[PDB]
Amino acid sequence: IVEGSDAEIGMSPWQVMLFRKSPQELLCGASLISDRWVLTAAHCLLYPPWDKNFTENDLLVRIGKHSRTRYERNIEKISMLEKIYIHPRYNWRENLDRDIALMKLKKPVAFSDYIHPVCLPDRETAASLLQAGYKGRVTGWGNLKETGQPSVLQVVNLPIVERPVCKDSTRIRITDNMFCAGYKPDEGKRGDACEGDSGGPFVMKSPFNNRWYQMGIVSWGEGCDRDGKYGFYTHVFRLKKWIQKVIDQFG
Amino acid sequence: ADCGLRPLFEKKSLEDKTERELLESYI
Ligand SMILES: N=C(N)c1ccc(CNC(=O)[C@@H]2CCCN2C(=O)[C@@H](Cc2ccccc2)NS(=O)(=O)Cc2ccccc2)cc1
Ligand SMILES: *[C@@H]1O[C@H](CO)[C@@H](O)[C@H](O)[C@H]1NC(C)=O
Ligand code: NA
Ligand code: NA
């Protein structure tokens, strides 16, 4: 996260770290959506142009974390993966369309003060909140700058951007399965997700029921926090039918 | 059923330092 700040303790209890077993390193962010299911970006697991194709045994999920590098004894919980499910129409060839994946855990994780699931949006909450100017929140342990790494989980609040402005900021083909967020050059603030924040959640707090909803997944961006560029996020609601189908079939 | 309600915030009626920024953006 670029130009963010340190998270408060328990501020994002659905935040998950995807952790590579060998060599031990941060792979991506992710989010907890139930006691057995974790949501992330497909490109965290599968991206052939960069020779990336992780299997279940390659990875661990670490839940309840705050510190990036330290083993948070008595606080974090570490889970093994039972199965990875990548969206069957994930477009790694072109533009990361449908950049979404689910991971089923081998065993349920116990919720605690530091470990708790986020909600997935219904149609109405999505329609109400996914509007230009409305702010969401991104969290992660990714780079502090495009070109280092944070001691603890970082957080930044960012406004959703008008679709034509998103489209006009890039040569990449944007789809309805994406949205973009960030400040414009003219505005007096900045901030962005970056490498390593990939797969983590873009959340919004519903003013109707005071619950946090995951509207987006950190997907892609041209550099990080560049003037005139925006961060792009997988549109979770648009892909919720697939999420439901996977959980109903394999849950 | 309990999704999206944080034990250290919503569950104990405490606000985090910047959530108000989000609310203020929601017309
Ligand atoms: N909000 C951000 N700035 C952000 C968010 C997530 C990521 C991680 N994702 C990604 O890295 C995805 C996965 C594959 C490439 N890609 C990118 O974002 C590309 C653009 C691209 C998009 C689609 C298809 C092909 C290329 N820009 S990029 O400049 O190379 C991304 C990048 C930024 C900083 C450091 C390293 C890489 C990177 C940056
Ligand atoms: C990725 O890995 C799986 C399993 O090892 C393999 O079957 C698949 O063909 C590989 N490539 C892609 C694009 O999925
Ligand atoms: Na364009
Ligand atoms: Na920018």
Where do the domains of chain A lie? 1-12+118-237, 13-117+238-250
Whole-number Å distance between alpha carbons of A46 and A9: 32
User: Is the domain covering A13-117+238-250 a CATH 2.40.10.10 domain?
Assistant: yes
What domains lie within chain B, and their CATH numbers? 1-27 (4.10.140.10)
Whole-number Å distance between alpha carbons of A149 and A33: 26
Residues of B in contact with A216 (CB under 8 A): none
Strand partners, A2: A192
**Domain pair A1-12+118-237 / A13-117+238-250, same fold:** yes
The answer to whether the beta carbons of residues B8 and A10 sit under 8 Å apart is yes
Ligand nearest to the CA of A228: 4
Q: What's at A196, amino acid-wise? A: G
DSSP one-letter code for A188: S
A116: annotated active-site residue:
no
Whole-number Å distance between alpha carbons of A194 and A34: 26
Do the Cβ atoms of B25 and A210 come within 8 Å? no
- What is the chain B residue with the closest CA to A6? B17
| A210: three-class secondary structure by DSSP | coil
> How many residues are given for chain B?
27
| B8: three-class secondary structure by DSSP | coil
Q: Return the C-alpha torsion angle A190, A196, A201, A203, nearest 10.
A: -20
A5: annotated active-site residue:
no
- Atom 15 of ligand 1, nearest CA residue: A220
Q: What's at A105, amino acid-wise? A: L
Ligand nearest to the CA of A190: 4
DSSP one-letter code for A117: P
Q: Return the C-alpha torsion angle B23, A102, A104, A115, nearest 10.
A: -20
Q: What's at A71, amino acid-wise? A: Y
Handedness of CA A207, A14, A147, A68 (dihedral sign): positive
Ligand 2, atom nearest to A53 Cα: 1
Residues of A in contact with B2 (CB under 8 A): 116-117
- Residues A1-12+118-237, CATH architecture: Beta Barrel (2.40)
Ligand 1, atom nearest to A146 Cα: 34
Angle ∠(A27,A29,A34) on CA atoms, nearest 5: 125
Whole-number Å distance between alpha carbons of A224 and A140: 14
B:1-27 residues touching chain A, CB 8 A cutoff: 2-10, 16-19, 21-23, 25-27
- What is the chain B residue with the closest CA to A204? B22
Whole-number Å distance between alpha carbons of A226 and A8: 26
End-to-end CA distance of chain B: 27
| B11: three-class secondary structure by DSSP | helix
- Residues whose beta carbon lies within 6 Å of some atom of ligand 2: A 46, 48, 53, 55
For residues A61-81, one letter each, b for 16 or more C-beta atoms within 10 angstroms of the residue's C-beta and e for the rest, the string is: bbbbbbebeeeeeebbbebeb
A79: annotated active-site residue:
no
Handedness of CA B4, A6, A109, A43 (dihedral sign): positive
Residues of B in contact with A9 (CB under 8 A): 8
The answer to whether the beta carbons of residues A168 and A154 sit under 8 Å apart is no
Whole-number Å distance between alpha carbons of A131 and A142: 26
Q: Which of A15, A198, A248, A4 is nearest to B18 (CA)?
A: A4
Strand partners, A77: A63
